[PDB]
Protein backbone atom coordinates (compact mmCIF):
# COMPACT_ATOMS: atom_id res chain seq x y z
CA UNK A 1 0.00 0.00 0.00
CA UNK A 2 3.02 2.38 0.03
CA UNK A 3 2.14 5.50 -1.96
CA UNK A 4 4.05 6.21 -5.13
CA UNK A 5 4.86 9.45 -6.88
CA UNK A 6 1.78 9.38 -9.14
CA UNK A 7 -0.49 8.86 -6.11
CA UNK A 8 0.44 12.02 -4.20
CA UNK A 9 -0.53 15.45 -5.59
CA UNK A 10 2.16 18.08 -5.03
CA UNK A 11 1.14 19.91 -1.90
CA UNK A 12 -0.40 16.87 -0.22
CA UNK A 13 1.29 14.63 2.35
CA UNK A 14 0.54 11.02 3.09
CA UNK A 15 1.59 8.97 6.10
CA UNK A 16 2.44 5.27 6.12
CA UNK A 17 2.75 3.26 9.31
CA UNK A 18 5.91 1.11 9.10
CA UNK A 19 5.82 -0.38 12.60
CA UNK A 20 4.40 0.38 16.00
CA UNK A 21 5.17 4.03 16.67
CA UNK A 22 6.97 4.63 13.35
CA UNK A 23 5.54 6.28 10.24
CA UNK A 24 7.04 7.55 7.06
CA UNK A 25 5.75 10.82 5.60
CA UNK A 26 5.57 11.02 1.82
CA UNK A 27 5.34 14.20 -0.24
CA UNK A 28 6.07 15.18 -3.81
CA UNK A 29 7.77 18.10 -5.46
CA UNK A 30 8.33 19.44 -8.94
CA UNK A 31 12.05 19.74 -9.65
CA UNK A 32 14.13 19.91 -12.85
CA UNK A 33 10.91 19.45 -14.83
CA UNK A 34 10.10 16.13 -13.15
CA UNK A 35 8.00 15.10 -10.18
CA UNK A 36 9.73 13.23 -7.37
CA UNK A 37 8.39 11.70 -4.16
CA UNK A 38 10.27 12.25 -0.93
CA UNK A 39 10.19 10.49 2.44
CA UNK A 40 10.79 11.45 5.99
CA UNK A 41 10.05 9.73 9.31
CA UNK A 42 7.83 10.23 12.33
CA UNK A 43 8.71 8.41 15.56
CA UNK A 44 6.54 8.31 18.66
CA UNK A 45 8.39 9.85 21.62
CA UNK A 46 6.17 8.99 24.54
CA UNK A 47 3.19 11.35 24.25
CA UNK A 48 5.05 13.48 21.70
CA UNK A 49 6.43 12.98 18.19
CA UNK A 50 9.93 13.26 16.78
CA UNK A 51 10.01 14.29 13.12
CA UNK A 52 12.81 13.32 10.77
CA UNK A 53 13.10 15.73 7.81
CA UNK A 54 10.70 18.26 6.38
CA UNK A 55 8.33 17.45 3.53
CA UNK A 56 10.40 19.41 0.97
CA UNK A 57 9.09 22.92 1.10
CA UNK A 58 6.99 25.25 3.20
CA UNK A 59 3.62 24.34 1.68
CA UNK A 60 4.31 20.62 1.90
CA UNK A 61 5.58 20.95 5.47
CA UNK A 62 2.45 22.79 6.55
CA UNK A 63 0.45 19.95 4.98
CA UNK A 64 2.65 17.48 6.88
CA UNK A 65 1.85 19.07 10.23
CA UNK A 66 -1.86 19.06 9.41
CA UNK A 67 -1.82 15.41 8.37
CA UNK A 68 0.04 14.43 11.54
CA UNK A 69 -2.57 16.15 13.68
CA UNK A 70 -5.44 14.58 11.73
CA UNK A 71 -4.06 11.03 11.67
CA UNK A 72 -1.92 10.75 14.84
CA UNK A 73 -2.89 13.69 17.05
CA UNK A 74 0.30 13.88 19.14
CA UNK A 75 2.35 17.09 19.12
CA UNK A 76 5.52 17.33 17.04
CA UNK A 77 8.03 18.70 19.54
CA UNK A 78 11.40 18.07 17.84
CA UNK A 79 12.63 17.63 14.28
CA UNK A 80 15.97 16.47 12.91
CA UNK A 81 17.13 17.28 9.38
CA UNK A 82 19.46 14.65 7.98
CA UNK A 83 21.36 16.92 5.56
CA UNK A 84 21.33 20.49 4.31
CA UNK A 85 19.37 20.23 1.05
CA UNK A 86 15.85 21.55 0.61
CA UNK A 87 14.08 18.16 0.73
CA UNK A 88 15.39 17.91 4.34
CA UNK A 89 15.36 21.50 5.63
CA UNK A 90 12.91 23.22 3.28
CA UNK A 91 10.03 23.94 5.64
CA UNK A 92 12.11 24.35 8.81
CA UNK A 93 10.70 27.88 9.11
CA UNK A 94 7.17 26.41 9.14
CA UNK A 95 8.19 23.90 11.81
CA UNK A 96 9.76 26.66 13.90
CA UNK A 97 6.63 28.80 13.69
CA UNK A 98 4.57 25.79 14.84
CA UNK A 99 6.67 25.43 17.99
CA UNK A 100 8.81 22.53 16.82
CA UNK A 101 12.40 22.54 18.05
CA UNK A 102 14.49 21.98 14.93
CA UNK A 103 17.90 20.25 15.05
CA UNK A 104 20.75 19.37 12.74
CA UNK A 105 24.44 18.74 13.00
CA UNK A 106 26.82 21.72 13.01
CA UNK A 107 27.96 20.67 9.55
CA UNK A 108 24.41 20.63 8.21
CA UNK A 109 23.66 24.04 9.74
CA UNK A 110 26.80 25.52 8.19
CA UNK A 111 26.18 24.01 4.76
CA UNK A 112 22.56 25.13 4.82
CA UNK A 113 23.67 28.70 5.52
CA UNK A 114 26.23 28.59 2.70
CA UNK A 115 23.61 27.18 0.31
CA UNK A 116 20.92 29.66 1.34
CA UNK A 117 18.64 27.00 2.76
CA UNK A 118 16.71 27.14 6.01
CA UNK A 119 18.82 26.59 9.10
CA UNK A 120 17.65 24.30 11.91
CA UNK A 121 17.89 26.02 15.26
CA UNK A 122 19.66 23.51 17.51
CA UNK A 123 23.05 21.87 16.99
CA UNK A 124 23.46 18.11 17.44
CA UNK A 125 26.70 17.21 19.18
CA UNK A 126 28.66 14.00 18.73
CA UNK A 127 28.23 13.38 15.00
CA UNK A 128 31.30 15.01 13.47
CA UNK A 129 33.37 11.87 12.73
CA UNK A 130 32.54 8.90 10.52
CA UNK A 131 31.09 6.13 12.63
CA UNK A 132 29.75 8.46 15.31
CA UNK A 133 26.38 7.54 16.79
CA UNK A 134 24.29 9.36 19.36
CA UNK A 135 20.91 8.60 20.84
CA UNK A 136 18.29 11.31 20.38
CA UNK A 137 14.97 10.51 21.99
CA UNK A 138 13.63 7.27 20.52
CA UNK A 139 16.17 7.10 17.67
CA UNK A 140 19.88 6.71 17.15
CA UNK A 141 21.53 9.18 14.80
CA UNK A 142 24.54 7.88 12.88
CA UNK A 143 27.05 9.74 10.73
CA UNK A 144 28.34 7.09 8.28
CA UNK A 145 30.71 9.39 6.44
CA UNK A 146 30.22 11.34 3.25
CA UNK A 147 27.85 9.84 0.67
CA UNK A 148 24.99 11.74 -0.99
CA UNK A 149 26.36 14.75 0.90
CA UNK A 150 29.27 15.26 3.25
CA UNK A 151 26.91 15.83 6.22
CA UNK A 152 24.31 13.14 5.63
CA UNK A 153 22.95 11.34 8.70
CA UNK A 154 21.02 8.13 8.96
CA UNK A 155 18.47 7.34 11.65
CA UNK A 156 17.81 4.03 13.36
CA UNK A 157 14.70 3.30 15.44
CA UNK A 158 15.80 0.51 17.84
CA UNK A 159 12.33 -0.39 19.11
CA UNK A 160 11.04 -1.04 15.57
CA UNK A 161 14.21 -2.13 13.68
CA UNK A 162 13.66 0.68 11.17
CA UNK A 163 16.67 2.19 9.38
CA UNK A 164 16.00 5.51 7.68
CA UNK A 165 18.74 6.20 5.16
CA UNK A 166 17.69 9.54 3.82
CA UNK A 167 19.17 10.49 0.47
CA UNK A 168 22.22 8.29 1.04
CA UNK A 169 20.05 5.24 0.33
CA UNK A 170 18.27 4.73 -3.00
CA UNK A 171 15.01 2.90 -3.57
CA UNK A 172 15.25 -0.23 -5.70
CA UNK A 173 13.40 1.26 -8.67
CA UNK A 174 16.15 3.89 -9.04
CA UNK A 175 18.91 2.28 -11.10
CA UNK A 176 20.81 5.46 -11.99
CA UNK A 177 22.33 8.18 -9.83
CA UNK A 178 21.13 11.76 -10.04
CA UNK A 179 21.58 15.02 -8.16
CA UNK A 180 25.03 14.01 -6.95
CA UNK A 181 26.69 17.43 -7.27
CA UNK A 182 27.38 17.62 -3.52
CA UNK A 183 28.11 13.90 -3.15
CA UNK A 184 31.33 12.15 -2.32
CA UNK A 185 30.91 9.40 -4.91
CA UNK A 186 34.23 7.83 -3.97
CA UNK A 187 33.41 7.51 -0.27
CA UNK A 188 29.74 6.59 -0.64
CA UNK A 189 30.27 2.79 -0.91
CA UNK A 190 32.51 2.85 2.17
CA UNK A 191 29.92 4.90 4.05
CA UNK A 192 27.22 2.36 3.16
CA UNK A 193 29.54 -0.42 4.44
CA UNK A 194 29.65 1.41 7.77
CA UNK A 195 25.84 1.49 7.87
CA UNK A 196 25.58 -2.24 7.17
CA UNK A 197 28.19 -3.02 9.82
CA UNK A 198 26.50 -0.81 12.43
CA UNK A 199 22.83 -1.73 11.78
CA UNK A 200 22.86 -5.35 10.55
CA UNK A 201 19.69 -5.92 12.54
CA UNK A 202 17.57 -3.47 10.53
CA UNK A 203 14.37 -5.05 9.23
CA UNK A 204 13.01 -2.10 7.25
CA UNK A 205 15.09 0.37 5.27
CA UNK A 206 13.53 3.65 4.16
CA UNK A 207 15.24 5.57 1.32
CA UNK A 208 15.07 9.32 1.00
CA UNK A 209 12.87 8.88 -2.09
CA UNK A 210 10.65 5.94 -2.90
CA UNK A 211 9.57 2.60 -1.59
CA UNK A 212 10.91 1.04 1.61
CA UNK A 213 12.53 -2.34 1.52
CA UNK A 214 14.97 -4.48 3.42
CA UNK A 215 18.72 -4.30 3.89
CA UNK A 216 19.11 -5.15 0.17
CA UNK A 217 18.57 -1.43 -0.47
CA UNK A 218 22.10 -0.82 0.86
CA UNK A 219 23.85 -3.09 -1.65
CA UNK A 220 21.55 -1.79 -4.36
CA UNK A 221 22.65 1.76 -3.61
CA UNK A 222 26.34 0.77 -3.69
CA UNK A 223 25.80 -0.93 -7.05
CA UNK A 224 24.12 2.14 -8.58
CA UNK A 225 26.65 4.61 -7.16
CA UNK A 226 29.58 2.52 -8.40
CA UNK A 227 28.03 2.22 -11.86
CA UNK A 228 27.68 6.00 -12.01
CA UNK A 229 31.28 6.58 -10.93
CA UNK A 230 32.45 4.26 -13.71
CA UNK A 231 30.18 5.71 -16.42
Ligand X SMILES: C[C@@H]1C([C@H](C(=O)O)[C@@H](C)O)=N[C@H](C(=O)O)[C@H]1SC1Cn2cnc[n+]2C1
**Choice among 39, 60, 85, 152 that is catalytic:** 85
C-alpha–C-alpha distance, residues 136 and 36, integer Å:
29
Q: Clarify whether 83 is annotated catalytic.
A: yes
Q: How far is the CB of 103 from Zn ion (least distance, A)?
A: 9
Dihedral of CA atoms 146, 42, 123, 170 in degrees, nearest 10, equals: 10
Determine, following the binding rule CB under 5 A, whether residue 86 of this chain makes contact with Zn ion. Answer: no
Which of 45, 53, 67, 87 binds Zn ion (CB under 5 A)? It is 87
Cβ contacts of residue 82 below 8 Å, gap of 6+? 52, 53, 88, 104, 108, 152, 153, 154, 155, 164, 166, 167, 208
What count of other Cβ atoms lies within 10 Å of the Cβ of residue 8? 18
Q: In the set 86, 118, 151, 171, which binds Cl ion (CB under 5 A)? A: 86
User: Which residue in the set 165, 208, 210, 212 belongs to the binding site for Zn ion (CB under 5 A)?
Assistant: 208
The verdict on whether residue 83 carries a ligand-binding annotation is yes
Cβ closest to ligand X, residue 127 vs residue 167: 167
Q: Least Å distance between CB 115 and ligand X?
A: 10
Query: Among residues 167, 217, 218, 224, which is the contact residue for Zn ion, using CB under 5 A?
Result: 167
DSSP strand pairing (14-19 vs 76-80): unpaired
Q: Can residue 180 be called a binding residue for Cl ion (CB under 5 A)? A: no
Residues involved in catalysis: 83, 85, 87, 148, 179
Binding site listing: 83, 85, 87, 122, 148, 167, 209
Amino acid sequence: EYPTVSEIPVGEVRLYQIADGVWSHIATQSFDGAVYPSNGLIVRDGDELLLIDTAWGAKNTAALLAEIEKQIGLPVTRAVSTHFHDDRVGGVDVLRAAGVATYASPSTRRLAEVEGNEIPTHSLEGLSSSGDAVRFGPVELFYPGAAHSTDNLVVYVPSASVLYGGCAIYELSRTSAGNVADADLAEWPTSIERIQQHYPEAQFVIPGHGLPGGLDLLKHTTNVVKAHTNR
